[model samples]
Target: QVLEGLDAVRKRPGMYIGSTDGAGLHHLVWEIVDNAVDEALSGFGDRIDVTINKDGSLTVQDHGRGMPTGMHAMGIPTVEVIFTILHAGSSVVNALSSWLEVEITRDGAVYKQRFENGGKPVTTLKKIGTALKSKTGTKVTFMPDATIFSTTDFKYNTISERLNESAFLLKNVTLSLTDKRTDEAIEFHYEN
Candidate 1:
């Protein structure tokens, strides 16, 4: 069972996560952030922050409502359930559940998670204790899995160019990709 088609993808590494190159490495970050954007579309989050660290790790933060912290009927933390279980995410399932009406208090807290190489979670779910007074969101950070990625380091210009395209396409959304590794920083914001 462990070596199912999913493991086959992991074994080959190229067919599924794309080539074992820098572009593929960056794809993990984009995919997770895109999920956050979809959450925003569903009225869950508003702001997304993308940060590239000197260690070749990237972080995406959003100022949306934090993930649910309550216990499932089985006494499991909702956040814990989301990560450890496959096909268990809040996007489509929770949106359809009756629990959607259960009001969450920390609407502005950040729900942070990390992925490495081909979109695999490295860090466990973390809730940013700080809350925004005005809005809510989510954030994700991931280091490309070294074993599967050709290069962990990301290019600044490449990230910024993509951010520019996202800004043009998204309305009332701000896209910022900053390189904290160096003294320079880039910021982009727009409203349609």
Candidate 2:
């Protein structure tokens, strides 16, 4: 009965994400992508980028208001609370992955935080650099734990088709999928 935080996800992945097969692997990608889309849906952003990195990790970037970095009542960063807590919010992707790193650009500065071994923070949130005074967005890159999922190789067509449909469904929003493993890329843009 000691299931909490990332441990819970690692123990019963099927309960959290359905299955540890190819479908579940892709579902991890969707969990992050959907949050980016939500920013666009809420009129805070207009573009989303999904990339399959050469290292077999995945990255999702969104042009929107970055995640809040304030101190939470729980004595941790709000962003940490968002990713670590299973039912606290919409980002269970962190608890399922072997490693996850988040970069946020907002409030005239750029901040970064990294987690490993299923949502345990390997480093504290720190300001890494500077940015435009008003520019804002969020970028997340994560590697699925090989021991948990059956396959980590994400199919290009499987993801692009979904992003393509989502672009059509959400007018004026641009969604792009780039597979750096093979140097293939596609963009879906629809305007009413």
Candidate 3:
């Protein structure tokens, strides 16, 4: 099978994400957050932390089994392949981001990778440090491409509304959103 690379995504982001405006910008967060929630549904994680960082980027972290750090059969790190190809979800998000970093903590180790300029790998995956045996998760931080988007600012209200829906819909998952720009934070959990 042929691979449609990141270039196609950069050339026509709308084709992959529907629009280059706020809708598409927000869609990137949704894609990553949805994946985190799905991890909970699969019983590997329970908490999802969403944050608007001081640098104007967004991070979605989950206490799930960290993404596999091994090499893919395609001769790239599994996580890197996941970011570079058009998986129609997170990959598209990666391809539209100005910069993205994924940190994985599992198997008592911490691994990290970075990609930029529309999902081109800027660093090889490497063990960055060590993690406690009990610590395991994936954290993704990304800055949406301002050149292709109409707005890069993420509204805490919008994210809270969505996370609220997720909390209420998924009784087993806890979700939190922190806005560093405003120094505000909220958490949601529902058992009913």
Stronger candidate by TM-score (1 vs 3): 3
Using Cα atoms with residue i matched to residue i, what is each candidate's TM-score against the true structure?
A: 0.68, 0.95, 0.95
lDDT per residue for candidate 2 within 1-192, as digits (tens), equals 332577777888888788999999999988888889888989988899999999999999998999997888857889887888776223467877889999999989999999997888988778999999888999999999898999989999999998998898888999999999999999999989
Q: Best by TM-score, which number? A: 3
What TM-score quantifies how close candidate 2 is to the native fold?
A: 0.95
Candidate 1 residues 125-188, lDDT tens each? 4554655556554444445556656676778888788777766666566777788888467766
Measured with C-alpha atoms, the lDDT of residue 97 in candidate 2 is 80
What are the RMSDs of all candidates, in order?
Answer: 7.7, 2.0, 1.3
| Each model's lDDT | 0.54, 0.88, 0.90
Worst 10 residues of 3 by lDDT: 85-94
Poorly placed runs, candidate 1 (over 4 Å): 1-9, 43-45, 88-135
lDDT tens digits, residue span 18-87, model 3: 8988888888899999989988888888899999999999999999998988999866899988888864
